[PDB]
Design a protein around this ligand. Structure first.
Ligand code: FAD
Ligand code: FAD
Ligand code: HGZ
Ligand code: HGZ
Ligand code: ZN
Ligand code: ZN
Lengths: 230, 230
């Protein structure tokens, strides 16, 4: 039915497993009659650096640059760079934001980290006060769809990498919940490179099949308990 | 002495509290007679995107681009882009790598994420085998000197942000420990912007004092227990 989805996609190679997961999301959401938009960050040469080029107006303090102060004021005055406002319009319209990426250093690739740093500015995504459950993107859903090099077993509490949920914390809690998003359970596609060709097709099908009923899902409780236990 | 230090610094404004912290680290380590080098990433316009420009010459598989495979092959065949190779020479020579940055979204700014993603490549920082305790940079020390916008009290386990140690995990453990580093206790300068002209000088002065005895320090046990445990 009547939903708008933004997929923020961070992989260099269209033929990759990430590209397959993004393409199946588009195909299935499209099939459902949803509105779908993809921000293909590498193809867009998306600027990840937080710099003074992100404000085009008179600086609030031209003597000592403070990226958070200057972008907050620029957002209110409409003087942010247009690549930022282009992504902001997509997020604003979206009911669900899916992030599709390979795990780099237990986190997002820098090009996507740059999307979070620059697009989710004060005034647009949160305010002080106006964060966590009162964040400005309240009402919207977010979902991380992550691929890893490590196996599910490496990503357990007693495994070497620790539990998968541990690395989710700065993303689900520190970023998405902070901006007010309700967070759907992560899609984690373990070790596609080590899996067989059929185990891969299976992981792509499993994502497609989940997407069929994504509008029926409740979010996670995005708490310290959920991520860490005890 | 005879020790080498690399400071990887990620802040746009030389007059910032981050800039002050970097400058006192240069001043004090220089005073002790250490060899000191600073990678000032915003001044270098450091590239954060992981792309096929990171390999010069021609590719291992030009049909399907795999960043990890290609940069592993390029490292071995000495055909990585010169910005990467320049940083790897700094790291190879360094006995201690200090990361100086403001926390962005419970993590490093994207410009710094990009240095970790691009410089810490397979064959250089890690391989199979050679990770965690046996990572390729074993013997070297690493230290995160982070400033935050939130207060220490927000960064307690039952506070709004959770324990600081929770966000340190993907950086200290998933990145630095993985590559072989012994991780020195992070230096966390909580909410400098809400603090006095002093308190701030207190904070800078304490970073300078800690640096006096930095070579006597023992690394933290970089384990799940240290980050999450009882
Ligand atoms: C800087 C860097 C940091 C990293 N850090 C981490 C980390 O911290 N933790 C960790 O676990 N991993 C890490 N990795 C590894 C990375 O997460 C994995 O390599 C990545 O997740 C694999 O996803 P991919 O799309 O690149 O896989 P691909 O190699 O593209 O996928 C595997 C295979 O599936 C094929 N395929 C594509 N579509 C389909 C389909 N329709 N059906 C069947 N097969 C298909 C592909 O062509 C390929 O042959 C890191 C990698 C780099 C480069
Ligand atoms: C995208 C983004 C994401 C963020 N995400 C997070 C997050 O997840 N969690 C979080 O807690 N915060 C977050 N922050 C806020 C950020 O971490 C802090 O704003 C930053 O850490 C403050 O350090 P600074 O150097 O930038 O401060 P400054 O503003 O430069 O420091 C405060 C004052 O100290 C002055 N000063 C400089 N040198 C000295 C000195 N020698 N002695 C005394 N004073 C001096 C400065 O001029 C200034 O007036 C985020 C910010 C942005 C922009
Ligand atoms: C930094 O690169 C990689 C890092 C990791 C880390 C930190 C943990 C892990 O379990 N697997 C990895 C991996 O896959 C085997 C990588 O390369 C593909
Ligand atoms: C994205 O920006 C900010 C984010 C945070 C987060 C996630 C937690 C926190 O405790 N403080 C923050 C902060 O300091 C006021 C920021 O700067 C405005
Ligand atoms: Zn949460
Ligand atoms: Zn560790």
């Amino acid at each position: 039915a009547g939903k708008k989805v933004l997929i923020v996609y961070a992989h260099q190679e269209p033929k990759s497993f990430n590209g397959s997961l993004k393409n199946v999301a588009v195909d299935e959401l499209s099939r459902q009659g949803c509105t779908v938009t993809v921000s293909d960050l590498y193809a867009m040469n998306f600027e990840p650096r937080a710099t003074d080029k992100d404000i085009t107006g008179t600086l609030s303090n031209p003597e000592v640059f403070n990226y958070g102060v200057e972008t907050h004021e620029a957002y209110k005055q409409r003087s942010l760079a247009s690549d930022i406002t282009d992504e902001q319009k997509k997020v604003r319209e979206a009911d669900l934001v899916i992030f599709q990426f390979p795990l780099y250093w237990f986190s997002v690739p820098a090009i996507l980290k740059g999307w979070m740093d620059r697009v989710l500015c004060q005034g647009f995504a949160f305010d002080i006060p106006g964060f966590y459950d009162s964040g400005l993107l309240q009402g919207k859903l977010a979902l991380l769809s992550v691929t890893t090099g490590g196996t599910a077993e490496m990503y357990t509490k007693t495994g070497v990498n620790g539990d998968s949920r541990y690395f989710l914390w700065p993303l689900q809690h520190g970023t998405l919940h902070f901006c007010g998003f309700k967070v759907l359970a992560p899609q984690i596609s373990f070790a596609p490179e080590i899996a067989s060709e059929e185990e891969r097709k299976g992981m792509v099908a499993a994502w497609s099949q989940r997407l069929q009923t994504i509008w029926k899902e409740e979010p996670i409780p995005c708490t310290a308990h959920w991520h860490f236990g005890q």
